[PDB]
Design a protein around this ligand. Structure first.
Ligand code: FAD
Ligand code: NAP
Length: 337
């Protein structure tokens, strides 16, 4: 395991918070996972699973065995022509898995290009971008049950996926995800509902656009506009878009005719949290070593030397302010430890 004691977790989280782990272990398969568990329980410690630390807010030194998930394996399980079942291990890095699938002429992941982190973590938060979510192509996964050590498979329904949500995010510390299966496609329609994607693809004038083309466009948009954690510490969009009631949407829109919201099948409005934050006047905010990025209003940043507590308390302040200004509660995306 390359077990390690009293160890900075700085390089293991994208916010670049510097706290220490009682023990840090790397895992490369079920054997190692099972061993880390045993040990964790040997030493009387809780176990904290991490992938690439791209959706993690650490707020304190971690009295626990931290297990960096780093197993490997990407393969075609089964080819059924218009769809192909594929499987990847939890430690596989996400965007390179996407690239893998596209190099095999499989579509369905392109809209999730360049999302950081790991395959293992993807179902926990039901990763989504540009009109697509992991559940849309999800087939099943295999998870270790932390209450008794057994393996279980979850099919799509069992995972109780929702917007930036799953059974696994709902029952924290219960399931350890080992590998993931997705059903990808050939020959289906591209997902181009997001204007900037559609327009940037048009401008390249491909005769017959494919998934690979869509992926290059999305990677380019994301590199252009998104703070890279390796320069400016962050965990991406800090806040989920809030969904409001119809009569509450009605009321907010009376207050604000410029309000940005997207109607749902059930009558509710998905508000744009960037718009809210911006309009509450936080864009580019800065106060000691924390702030909100000047352009991307969802991206909370560590300008350098922030504590996790500082990011937390800034998030809290913004939430509080937006509750008070718009009557809306913004939920966090990152997992808080
Ligand atoms: C610059 C940037 C852009 C981003 N853009 C997007 C985006 O477009 N869409 C989107 O959805 N997200 C986005 N994110 C968030 C993030 O990349 C995803 O949430 C990602 O799935 C987290 O993966 P990770 O491996 O980094 O998870 P970590 O941050 O390592 O872990 C997240 C949570 O999952 C748990 N976990 C991790 N692995 C396992 C496992 N194997 N079994 C059980 N639990 C586990 C951890 O304990 C933790 O609670 C972005 C983040 C950044 C920094
Ligand atoms: N969570 C993260 O860390 C992270 C980081 C980077 C990008 N992203 C995602 O990647 C995509 C691009 O991000 P962005 O920050 O540039 O925002 P964007 O495309 O400028 O869109 C801004 C806001 O409008 C919404 N939106 C735009 N077009 C839409 C449509 N056709 N239908 C429904 N909603 C629409 C987005 O919702 P949605 O967010 O619901 O799409 C978001 O609230 C988004 O889908 C976003 O979720 C996420």
């Amino acid at each position: 395991l390359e077990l390690q004691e009293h160890c900075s977790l700085k390089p293991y989280n994208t916010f670049g918070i510097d706290v220490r782990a009682r023990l840090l272990a790397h895992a490369r398969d079920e054997a190692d996972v099972r061993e880390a568990l045993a040990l964790a329980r040997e030493r009387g410690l809780p176990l904290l699973v991490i992938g690439g630390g791209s959706n993690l807010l650490l707020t304190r030194d971690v009295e626990a065995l931290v297990l960096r998930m780093a197993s490997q394996g990407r393969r075609i399980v089964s080819d059924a022509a218009d769809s192909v079942l594929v499987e990847a291990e939890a430690g596989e890095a996400w965007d390179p898995f996407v690239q893998w699938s596209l190099e095999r002429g499989l579509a369905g992941l392109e809209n999730l290009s360049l999302i950081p982190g790991t395959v293992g973590a993807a179902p926990m938060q039901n990763i989504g971008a540009y009109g697509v979510e992991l559940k849309d192509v999800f087939d099943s996964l295999t998870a270790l049950d932390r209450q008794d050590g057994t393996l279980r498979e979850f099919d799509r329904q069992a995972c109780r996926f929702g917007y930036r949500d799953s059974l696994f995010k709902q029952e924290p510390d219960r399931w350890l995800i080992l590998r993931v299966r997705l059903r990808l496609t050939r020959r289906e329609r591209l997902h181009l509902d997001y204007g900037p994607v559609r327009q940037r693809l048009e401008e390249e004038g491909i005769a017959s656009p494919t998934a690979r083309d869509v992926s290059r466009v999305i990677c380019a948009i994301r590199r252009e506009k998104l703070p890279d954690p390796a320069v400016l510490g962050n965990a991406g969009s800090f806040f989920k878009n809030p969904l409001v009631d119809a009569t509450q949407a009605e009321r907010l829109r009376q207050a604000f005719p410029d309000l940005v919201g997207y109607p749902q099948a059930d009558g509710r409005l998905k508000l744009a949290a960037g718009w809210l934050i911006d309009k509450g006047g936080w864009k580019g905010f800065r106060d000691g070593p924390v702030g909100v990025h000047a352009q991307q209003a969802l991206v909370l940043v560590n300008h350098g030397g922030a504590t996790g507590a500082q990011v937390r308390a800034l998030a809290e302040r913004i939430q509080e302010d937006v509750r008070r200004r718009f009557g809306v509660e913004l939920e966090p995306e990152p997992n808080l430890y």
